[PDB]
Each structure stands twice: as structure tokens, then as C-alpha cells.
A paper describes a structure:
To extend the structural coverage of proteins of unknown function, we targeted Pfam protein family PF06684 (domain of unknown function 1185; DUF1185) and determined the crystal structures of two representative members. Despite lacking any recognizable sequence similarity to other protein families, both proteins show significant structural similarity to proteins with a Bacillus chorismate mutase-like (BCM-like) fold characterized by a β-α-β-α-β-β core that includes a mixed β-sheet (order 1423) with the β4 strand antiparallel to the rest. Structural similarities to BCM and genome-context analysis suggest a function in amino-acid synthesis.
The crystal structure of BB2672 was determined to 1.7 Å resolution using the SAD method. The final model included three protomers (residues 2–192 of chain A, residues 1–192 of chain B and residues 2–192 of chain C), two tetraethylene glycol (PEG) molecules, 27 ethylene glycol molecules, four chloride ions and 566 water molecules in the asymmetric unit. BB2672 forms a single domain composed of seven β-strands (β1–β7; residues 6–16, 28–38, 78–85, 118–122, 129–135, 146–150 and 160–168), three α-helices (H1, H3 and H4; residues 50–71, 92–95 and 97–108) and three 310-helices (H2, H5 and H6; residues 73–75, 142–144 and 182–184). BB2672 contains a central five-stranded mixed β-sheet with 12734 topology that packs against helices H1, H3 and H4. Analysis of the BB2672 crystallo­graphic hexamer reveals a trimer of dimers, with two distinct types of dimerization interface created by an extra N-terminal strand and a β-­hairpin insertion between strands β3 and β4 in the core BCM-like fold. The smaller interface at the N-terminus could present a potential ligand-binding site for the DUF1185 family, the genetic context of which supports a role in amino-acid metabolism. Proximal to this cavity, a highly con­served cluster of four histidines, His93, His98, His144, His174, is located within hydrogen-bonding distance of residues involved in the formation of intermolecular salt bridges. In SPO0826, most of these regions are disordered, indicating flexibility. This clustering of histidine residues in regions of some conformational variability and the proximity of salt bridges involved in oligomerization suggests that assembly of the BB2672 hexamer could be modulated by pH or salt concentration.
Numbering used by the authors:
A (entry chain B), D (entry chain B): 1 to 192
B (entry chain A), C (entry chain A), E (entry chain C), F (entry chain C): 2 to 192
Amino acid sequence: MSLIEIRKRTLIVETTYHENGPAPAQPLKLAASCAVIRNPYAGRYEPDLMPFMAELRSLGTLLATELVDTLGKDNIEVYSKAAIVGVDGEMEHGAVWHEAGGWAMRSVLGEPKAMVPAVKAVATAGYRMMVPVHYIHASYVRSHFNSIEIGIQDAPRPREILFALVMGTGARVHARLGGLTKEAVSVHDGQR
Amino acid sequence: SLIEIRKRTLIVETTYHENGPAPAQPLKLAASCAVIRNPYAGRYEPDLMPFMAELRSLGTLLATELVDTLGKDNIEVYSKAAIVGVDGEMEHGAVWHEAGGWAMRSVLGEPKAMVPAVKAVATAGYRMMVPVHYIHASYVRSHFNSIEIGIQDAPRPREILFALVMGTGARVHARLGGLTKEAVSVHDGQR
Amino acid sequence: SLIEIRKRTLIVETTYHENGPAPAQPLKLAASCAVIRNPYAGRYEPDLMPFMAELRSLGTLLATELVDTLGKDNIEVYSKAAIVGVDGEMEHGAVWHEAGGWAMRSVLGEPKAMVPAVKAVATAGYRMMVPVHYIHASYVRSHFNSIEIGIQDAPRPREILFALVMGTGARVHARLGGLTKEAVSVHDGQR
Amino acid sequence: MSLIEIRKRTLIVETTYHENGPAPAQPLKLAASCAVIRNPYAGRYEPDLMPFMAELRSLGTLLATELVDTLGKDNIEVYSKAAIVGVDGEMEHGAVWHEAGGWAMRSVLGEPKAMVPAVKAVATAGYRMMVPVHYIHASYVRSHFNSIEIGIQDAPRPREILFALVMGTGARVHARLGGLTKEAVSVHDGQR
Amino acid sequence: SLIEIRKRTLIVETTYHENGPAPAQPLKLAASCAVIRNPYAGRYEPDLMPFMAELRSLGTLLATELVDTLGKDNIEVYSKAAIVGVDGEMEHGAVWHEAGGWAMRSVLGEPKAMVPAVKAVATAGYRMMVPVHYIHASYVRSHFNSIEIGIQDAPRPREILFALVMGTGARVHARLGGLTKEAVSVHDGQR
Amino acid sequence: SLIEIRKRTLIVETTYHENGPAPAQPLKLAASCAVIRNPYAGRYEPDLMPFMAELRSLGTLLATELVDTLGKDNIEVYSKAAIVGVDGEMEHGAVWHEAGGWAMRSVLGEPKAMVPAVKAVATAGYRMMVPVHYIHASYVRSHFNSIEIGIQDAPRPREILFALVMGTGARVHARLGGLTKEAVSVHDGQR
Ligand SMILES: [Cl-]
Ligand SMILES: [Cl-]
Ligand SMILES: [Cl-]
Ligand SMILES: [Cl-]
Ligand SMILES: [Cl-]
Ligand SMILES: [Cl-]
Ligand SMILES: [Cl-]
Ligand SMILES: [Cl-]
């Protein structure tokens, strides 16, 4: 029997035109796909979370696919992943998403090289969290560091977990701090 | 133009269940929001009529996105909301009753129910529950619902966040009787 | 009895101005809230009808307090709200549309406008903007307004917070035209 | 010209019947009266806040009178005072309320002996704050320590201040930790 | 043992100024917090005396950490606080008045002022302003101040967060007169 | 100088367990934060390079405090963060990627892993979860973790809060395999 039971999902698309500076030619879009699932381990200590982590890869694929379909496969430049575990769970129940969300997303995207950044928390329902993103091909590209806030008002309830993926289309709208540029990426190790 | 958009958000919330027997089709509630500069922040402007008039165009934009997102034949509930930044006043949000409501109803081919609403003057990041009801008859009990809106970094003190909401049906475990969609007979927008 | 009250709050908010010319009389918006045990928390109950029926009595209690507080002849706007604790479901709050609305309208001698509403399932301490409109005609534009409600330590997971709101008039700097109280002519509850 | 301009006021009355224990014969009522006023010093450093503090005594009297009229003069057993200053102000703009709110309230109440407890903060509009209360005749009466949350959704705006007084009618609903009792008060110094 | 510690936090806040002429030395306020299991969560326990007794050692632990952090000779203000998880009750935090206060006063060589306090029953992540006053005379007007405490993931429903606060001086721009440190003469803990 | 510090906070969070078998030694995560005036609040400044350069010394200050708090030989995870006040912009926080990261890495003798980060433009009191990872190899799965930061009264609209985080080890009940500290072999800062 599946360990994955979805109560609700949210898709958010934030389009930023400017931040009071000269507007860029095209706006930035950052998008998050979230799913609220029952936590099969809430309220007890389970030493073996490996089966759960394995099955969650399919959830990763589902959410990542939705994001590509939303933004367009050719438009992805930044990503992230995140988890919010309900108060009857533990951090480790969210930590399964590093592999499940990250690997699934990277596979959907043709295996870009940058590690997918992440943030997670154990929190009360409605908790809002800033999710950091970076460039999919080289984590050090300075223009692309950014953030989007995620959260669902009534989730995760104590015995639930909220899993999320984030994708975006470009650089900060007024990026102007130099550093490594897309054109300067030369190692192709996922960093520089 | 009195309308200068900094950012927009589109939210689609799909509910499969709420721990009861899952309905055949999930519910989708969607919100389309725009954060704009408040041209009147920091002073008392006696005439907000031109602003209210022009805002209808923002209503059209947002409503059009919602219909494109959910499908025109799939709309059953709606709402409108405004959050005014702390340097503004409530009246700056009140303009949206007409601007958002009339624009959305026009987009939808003039359904009869008044569009429900909520508004506040608040700090950036304020989150607000937005109530929805049935577009053809406000009293259809199965359809009363809510969705939370908000943007983390908005409205900043001299901004306004305007939003519209559309949805596809009843609460996932609606079971409290009352007037049903099918029983609607007066067509006055209530019953 | 399905109604076990832990605590109640009564809030009266008097607004003198919002940085414009102060009206002759300030506006008062008041909310009366009750936190009760949710008899259905933690399970799916198919029949919420008895609960909805009994809750009318809670509606009467709260509405009566509001009228006693503001004065019966001074009521111009109203609303109703519910916040369900995290172990409950939205349907547990939905019972209040009838229970709170009908009870309040009865207390007020059956004004014609549907009582507006908002609800959520939320954590203890959740705060919610509650929209109000004119009791005799929902379209009276001057009267659309809001008040925030909430109780710091409620609803706890197995509780429900039910609330009613009454107010004494228009927004303090209402100036957006629309249908006025005086122009009300249809008496259908809208116009 | 007056330094006191009120935008809005709130009166809250919280009645507690129980906290899942055996209910007391009469419920506890805790009430807060708040006023949101313009801050005449927002955005600058003013060395002399003494005139403002002096005039604010009248605001203290107004709010304290409202509370007695609400709860009944014969029913008061606990109190407190609090201030929330908008973000363009400073803590000192709230600190004026120790004297202005405290002394005014004590005078309205016939000069009970216990110092009025207090809390204050400089915060964003909508900030919610727990206000602690204690027994008006002897601060150490253990049964009476309690709290009520105050706040106004849209206040204080940056250039405003929210001032508040609190009064209440008795002990915690399930007080059971011994300590100094009302009957044991014998020094009458405001402590014991 | 009735004391099972999940996590602890120590926070030291240094204030150089608040947009006025900076004082000679900055103010430091420090909070030491401990999150523990609530042995009584979910039931009404009439006898909390053994718990209150045992908590004295937790008071001593937190107080000793604060003295070791700021330096015994530098302490001029203090406070105590408790946040109880939502499955508990207020009385579960009330035990800290004696356990925290007496332990801290003992550690500090019995200063005379009553330790001020604030408490709440709240959801995980609740943030609370904690008021401090002068350790030798509660009326010393320059010393009234506050610090915010809270832990993001605590107290969970079956936990309690207990905290102590110490600080090194007056508000950075204290200028409202009243009783001064130097004018203290009663030594009753008030004046 | 473009750096004017109003206040600083140091927080050390000690985790003994998270309801599982407690590890041999607890985890400590520490955050060092500084609230400064935003020299650019309210205007678009095209050249933020001098500010970014000058901020390096603030990075060194905060990093040195963290090493002195936890001990240089005990550091295994780090992060950096910024919260910009509402009158600023995101770019005002973005300067901290280099200023914070490079300063901290220098203090730590140049560990290879990129310092993770998160930033926001927000209202005073905004709380933010900050993610950490292993300082020698970002992929070490046991070490991914987070700590919440924030100051109640900061950043005010014309301020910025800059922060660094260091920690001493893995999650208290890390058990998901993946790359281990011991298996690190590339030394590129990833694996
Ligand atoms: Cl990854
Ligand atoms: Cl409408
Ligand atoms: Cl109704
Ligand atoms: Cl006093
Ligand atoms: Cl005591
Ligand atoms: Cl004490
Ligand atoms: Cl960098
Ligand atoms: Cl770095």
C-alpha cells in the first residue's frame, strides 16, 4: 500500500516586473508546486525511513512535471526544494525530500549539474517559509540567487507533511553585483 | 495611468479531500493578485472616482487570467479582496468592490450574485482569508468557502494588493443541506 | 448539549477617523466570539445537522450581547465567522452560516440582507478579517467594511471559535458613491 | 495645542469559564482598553518627553474610567498597562505610559498599593502582545498572575502609538499553586 | 524526573542605540530558554506541587548560564516567562513564578525586587515580549524594558518552554525621570 | 562608513533530541546578527559595490564571534542570511552573498563548500528559516539542517539585518544515508 496520500496541492506563480528600479525586458517568474500529504510516521520514532524516501520520488516527479508544464521546459534557470513537517513529526520526515525532490526534479530537467538548494522546518499549520533558489547549471552565478515564500494556510496539520519544489526563469530583476555570470561558467561541475 | 504593477501572483489550490470520502472531482480555488503603487498613499484625496474607474481594467486582467486558468465553463464561485499598505486608507481598497466585482462579472457573462469581498489596511506580508460564494445564487449553501491570499513582501506602505478569486464547485464534503444549485429559481442573484 | 463554552470575547472598535475629515459620529464595529469544544474533532461525521440546529442558540446568545452593547436602533452592518481548530474540518465551521446568520437576523427583526461571512480551519491564535455589509441592502457601497477577530489561545485543535459582528454605520470616510441607504427601494436584501 | 490625537480605540472583554478543569463558581473577566494616537515625535529624537508624559495622564484616566464602567468598580482585582510604539518611534515613546497609565489608573481605583505591571514594544502594525497582570493590593498573591493578549490589526502604524490598560476580576480559573493569598496579605506595602 | 529537555536556546541582544545619542556602553539583555515535555498535557492534574518543586533545578540551570554569560556583577534587570503548548494549561506555566523566580534570586544573592513575568498557552513558534525591571527596586523608571523570546518549533502541543531573562542596565535613551538607582532608599524591593 | 550598527543578537540553540534516541553529543547551531542602517533605502542606487566591499568587515566581525562562541575546531555547518527593510530592495541584501560568505570562509581557513543562503525584503519582526550544510562537502546528507532567525523590532523600513550561522554537526537523528563525512573524496566543496 502506498505511503503517499495527498490532501491538497498548491501551485503558485509569482511574476515580478520590477523592484522600483529600471524594469527588465522580461519579468521574472518564480513558481512553487506544493503537496500536503499524511505523515505515516507522525507520533513515533521510525528508524527506517528508506521506503518512504524511495516512494516519494514519484511525488517529486509529479510536482516537477507540473512546474515545467507551467513555466515551459525551455525557460528554467533556477530551482529549489523545501519541506514543512507538522508538529507531530520530526525534521527527518522532511529530510527525505533532499533526495526525493532533488533527484526527481533534476531528472525531469535533463540532469542539470547544480545541487538543488533547500530549506525545511517542523512547524505549525500555516507556517510561511522563504525558499532560496539558485542557477541550475552553476550554483555560484551571482545574478540568480533569489527567494520565494511558500506555505499553505491550513497545512501541514500536526500529522501531515508539506513538500515543495520551486522553479524560476531567470535572474533577480535588478541584479547588479557582478560575480560569476552564465557566460563565465566554465567548469561545469555544478558550481562554476 | 494610475496603475503601476510591481508584481502579480497566481495561486491554484486543489483540494482532494478533508479526511472524509473524496469527491469524484477535486475542488480548485484560484486567486489572481496584483501589487500596485498607491497613488494616494500619505494624503487624504477627496476624489477617488478616477482611480476606481481605471481599476476596472485591472479587474479585467485578473479575471481573464482566472478564466483562462480554470476554464470558463468550470466557474462556480468567486470573490474579491484588497490589502492596502500602512500609508494608505481603507477607502483605497474600497474602490475594488466596483472595479474588481463589475469587471469579473462582465468577464463571466454577468452572473447575478454579488461578488463577496474582504479588505484591510495592513503590513507587508499580511495574509487574509477570502470568502467565496456561488456565482448564480448567493444562498447556495454547498458553495460557501474560503481561500487565503497574500504576498510576503506586499503591500509595502505605499502599495495596494488587489485580488480576485474563482473556484470550480462546492466544499469537498459539503453536507449541510440548504439551497442547491439545482433548486435555484428566483434568479435575482440570491435564490 | 453539543455546546460547551470555554471562553468568550467581546470586542468594540471605535474609529474616529482615518486621517481624513472626522465624521460627526465615530463608527463602532463590535464582535462577540465564543470558543467551544468541537464534538466532531478527529473524525468524519456524516450528520452535522443536529449540531447546526443547536448552534442557533449560540447565535442568539452572541447576537443578543451585540445588540445590548451597541443599541438595537443603532445597527447598520453585520457579519459572521468561524475558525475551526486543526483537528476539525471546514464543514464544522460551515454550520455557522445558518446558525449564526439566521439567529442574528431573528434578533434584529428579520433584516433582508444575507449576512456575509468568512471561515477557516486554523491554528490557535489565528486572526481573521471579517467583512460586513448593510443589513437592509447588501449593495449599499458606503457600508462595506471589515474588523479583525481572533483569540490568542483559540481555537485549540479540538475547538471551534464562532463569532458574530455588528456595526453602527458607514466607513468613516466613505466617498465612492454607489447605492445609498436612502435610495434602497427593492427590499429584496440587495437593493 | 494637545499632543493627543486619537484615531481609534478598542475595548475587549474576555470571559473565561474554564481551562478544561473544574469550572469556578464565577468566570474570570479580563478587559483591555486601547487607544491609537499619533506620535508627535516619530522620526526624530526629542530629548524632552516630559510634556507628552504629563498630558497622557488624561488618556490614562479616560481608559481606566472606561474599564471600571465596563467591569464594575467593585469587581477589580488585577491590572496592567502596556504600550506598542510604531516603527518610526522609539521605546521611550511608550515608556511614558508607566507614569501616565499607571498613576492615572491607580488614582481612578482609589490608590491600590501594588505597582501596575507592564510590557511594551516597538513593532509593526498588527503586532499582538501578551500583557501580564497581577493583584492590585499585593503583587505576590500567586493565584492572580495572569495574562491577556492585546493588539489592533492596523495599529500602530509607523507614526502612531497604541496605549493600553488592563483590568480583571479575579484569580486564574484553576489556580492551585499555593503561595500568598488575598487573606494572607498583611504588610500592605503593595507586595505582601 | 519530571524534567526532560529537548532543546535550549541562549540569546544575547546588544543595543548600541535607538536613533538617539548612543550611550557610553551598550545594553545587553539575555534570555535562557528550555523546552521540556509537559508531564500533564491532556489531563487535569490537581497536584502540580511536585513539578513546581523539581523545576527549581531548571531555574538554577538557566540562571547560572545567564550569570556566566553576562557576569554576576553586571546584572541590573531580570524577568521570567513560560509558554505552554496547546494541549496543556496556563497553570502548567504558572509553576515558573516560584521555580524560576526563586532560583534566579538565589543565584543572584537575593536581590529584593520581585521578578516580573509573562506567560501564555500557545502554538509552536509563538513569540512573546518579556518585561524586565531593576533587580533592587522595581520602581526604577530608567530600567523598565523588554526582550522578545520564542523558539520556532516549540512548544509543541505536549511541551512547555520556560525562560529566564537578565540584563545589564537601563534603556539606551532613558530620560523620563522617576526613581533612579541612586535614589533607592527603602530597600523593600520597590523603592 | 556605510555601516552603522543599531543592535546585534547572538543565538545559540542546543538540541538534545527530537523524540528519538538522543545522540552522544547534542547539536549546537548559532546565529550572529547585526541590524544596520540602509544607506540606500528609498532610492535606486546603481552602484552597490562600495557597500558590498565595506560589508566584508561586518562579515568578519560576525564570523569571528561565532568561532569564538562554538570553537573553531567544532564547526561543521554554516549559512548566511539577510532581511531587508520594506523601504529597501532585495539587491541590498544580495550584497551579503559575497560579504558574508567570503568573510566567514576566510575566518574558517577556507572550507570548500559554498555557503548556503536565504534572503528577504520584509517587515520588522520577520522570522526566517536559514538552511545550513556541511562546510567541506555540500552533499553530506546528514548535515542539512535549519535554524530560525529574526529580531522583533528589525529591520525597520530603512534598515537591513545581516546574519551568519555556524553549527557543530549533523541532524540529531540523521538516518537517510547519502554521502557521509567519511566518504568525502572529491574536495571540490560538493563531494
Ligand atoms: Cl539535489
Ligand atoms: Cl459585485
Ligand atoms: Cl444569513
Ligand atoms: Cl504604577
Ligand atoms: Cl511567587
Ligand atoms: Cl520572584
Ligand atoms: Cl558569491
Ligand atoms: Cl560563499
